[PDB]
Amino acid sequence: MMVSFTARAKSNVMAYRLLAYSQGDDIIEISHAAENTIPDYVAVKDVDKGDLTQVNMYPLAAWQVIAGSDIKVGDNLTTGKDGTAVPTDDPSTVFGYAVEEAQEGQLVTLVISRSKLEH
Amino acid sequence: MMVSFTARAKSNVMAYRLLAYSQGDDIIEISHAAENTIPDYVAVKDVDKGDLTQVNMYPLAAWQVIAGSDIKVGDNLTTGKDGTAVPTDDPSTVFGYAVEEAQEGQLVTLVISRSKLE
Amino acid sequence: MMVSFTARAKSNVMAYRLLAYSQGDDIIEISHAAENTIPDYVAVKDVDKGDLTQVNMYPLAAWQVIAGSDIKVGDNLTTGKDGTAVPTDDPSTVFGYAVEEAQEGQLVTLVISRSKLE
Numbered sequence: 001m002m003v004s005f006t007a008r009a010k011s012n013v014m015a016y017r018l019l020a021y022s023q024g025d026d027i028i029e030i031s032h033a034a035e036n037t038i039p040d041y042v043a044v045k046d047v048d049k050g051d052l053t054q055v056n057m058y059p060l061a062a063w064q065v066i067a068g069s070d071i072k073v074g075d076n077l078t079t080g081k082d083g084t085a086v087p088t089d090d091p092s093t094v095f096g097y098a099v100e101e102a103q104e105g106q107l108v109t110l111v112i113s114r115s116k117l118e119h
Numbered sequence: 120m121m122v123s124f125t126a127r128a129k130s131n132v133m134a135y136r137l138l139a140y141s142q143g144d145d146i147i148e149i150s151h152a153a154e155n156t157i158p159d160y161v162a163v164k165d166v167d168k169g170d171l172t173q174v175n176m177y178p179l180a181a182w183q184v185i186a187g188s189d190i191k192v193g194d195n196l197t198t199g200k201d202g203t204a205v206p207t208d209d210p211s212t213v214f215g216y217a218v219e220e221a222q223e224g225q226l227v228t229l230v231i232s233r234s235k236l237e
Numbered sequence: 238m239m240v241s242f243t244a245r246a247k248s249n250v251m252a253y254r255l256l257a258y259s260q261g262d263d264i265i266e267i268s269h270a271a272e273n274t275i276p277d278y279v280a281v282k283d284v285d286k287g288d289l290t291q292v293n294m295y296p297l298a299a300w301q302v303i304a305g306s307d308i309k310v311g312d313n314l315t316t317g318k319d320g321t322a323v324p325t326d327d328p329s330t331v332f333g334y335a336v337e338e339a340q341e342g343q344l345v346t347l348v349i350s351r352s353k354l355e
Contacts, residue, residue: 003181005218005228021218021230023193028218038236041180059177059296060235062240073242074260095236098260099242099265109240111294112235115275119260122299124346125335140336140354142311147336161347176298176348 004056007046016066016107017043017083030055030081036093038114039079060112067102074098076116077108091116126174128166135185135226136162138200149174151202155212157233158198180234193217196229199222204229239295246284253303254280255343256322267292269320273330275351276316299348304339311335313353314345328353 010022010029018039022029030053033039042063047053057105068080071087080086085108088094097117102108121199127143129150137158141148149166152158161182166172187203197212199205204227207213214232221227245261248268252259255276259266267284270276279300284290305321308314315330317323322345334354339345 001177001179003179003183003228005181007218026192026220028192040236050149057179057181060180061178061294061296062238064238072260073263074258074265099240101263109242111240112298113277114235114237117258117260117265117277120293120295120297122297122301122346124299124348126336140348142354145310145338147310178296178349214347 001059004054007053007055009049009051009053012049013043013047013053014066014083015046016064018065018079018085019043019083027062030116033079035079035081036088038091038093038095039083043083059104062099062109062111063096064104064109067104067106067108069104071098071102071108073101074117074119076093077110085110089116121175123173125171125173127171128168130168131201132162132166133185134162134164136182137198137204138202152198154200155197155207155209157212158202162202167193178235179231180236181218181228181230182215183226183228186223186225186227188223190217190221192220192229196227201203210220239241239293241291241293243289244292245292246286246288248284249278250284251303251320252280252282253301255302255316255322256280256320265292270316272316272318273327274316274326275330275332276320279321297349299336299346300333301344301346304341304343304345306341308335308339308345310338311354316346 010093016110068084068086075087078088096110129148137152139152184204187199187205194206197207215229255270257270305317305323310322333347338346
């Protein structure tokens with residue numbers, strides 16, 4: 001159950017980083033989601049600025065994202081720098097919670113959820 | 120692993136049209152979502168009025184629907200006629216935005232507002 | 238994609254009951270969701286208090302859950318007692334709506350939704 005569309009990278013996109021969709025010229029542009037925002041989707045490949053890319057979207061349950069800092073199992077997560085995922089406690093910016101442990105730079109597996117886990 | 124349910128078409132349903140769920144006697148019913156309403160899902164096959172179907176619903180951030188008129192990238196979309204997707208200027212009726220161009224009758228891909236990301 | 242992780246039961250958990258997740262000591266802890274709360278998932282097997290268990294979470298838009306009382310198609314559902322699903326009128330507590338009927342104690346199928354049907 002995959003749905004695909006073509007996009008243009010408006011800035012360099014690295015694999016396993018959170019993505020924002022934006023209005024380009026006759027095309028959707030993708031870029032790393034901004035810090036402390038709710039992402040639109042997640043990248044699974046690296047795209048160079050200005051290149052076309054096929055964005056394949058899958059049913060939502062869990063995402064694999066690079067950790068922007070140390071993440072503990074059960075942390076609530078928001079967007080960090082460069083489209084990474086980082087812990088937060090601001091409920092209005094949470095988009096998921098970690099179910100694996102990850103040091104900064106490692107791939108974290110998170111469950112998509114706009115509600116925080118009770119700590 | 121998928122959790123399915125039986126549904127009955129309240130009226131004739133066409134593949135890749137927007138659907139609304141409604142209560143029936145011992146059956147959830149499906150029909151094309153009404154003009155300018157927020158849809159519940161999208162049909163995968165034709166279902167004649169009165170016939171049953173197994174709904175295999177996925178939580179998606181993007182849908183593919185038949186365009187009811189010409190659509191430009193980024194247009195905000197609501198339900199048109201016969202369960203199609205069309206642009207609108209009324210924010211309270213929008214359920215997603217187009218991520219590609221489509222002419223009337225062409226499949227259009229769109230990104231949903233009311234997903235697990237809302 | 239689905240995810241599989243190892244959790245610890247904070248309390249006794251029964252098959253097809255609503256679950257709440259909480260943060261434990263570098264592990265997710267599970268227990269029956271509390272009455273009138275929004276659950277995080279549903280158990281597929283009994284788990285004794287203190288035991289580790291393998292949770293497999295799939296991309297599902299519908300769940301199967303034990304009914305806490307008689308449920309009719311279209312009922313908006315919240316968490317009842319002992320992790321069961323019951324009808325409710327409080328919009329703040331709804332987590333889905335029934336798409337099949339179920340007597341108390343049987344399995345009901347529901348579509349996940351923070352909004353009431355219609």
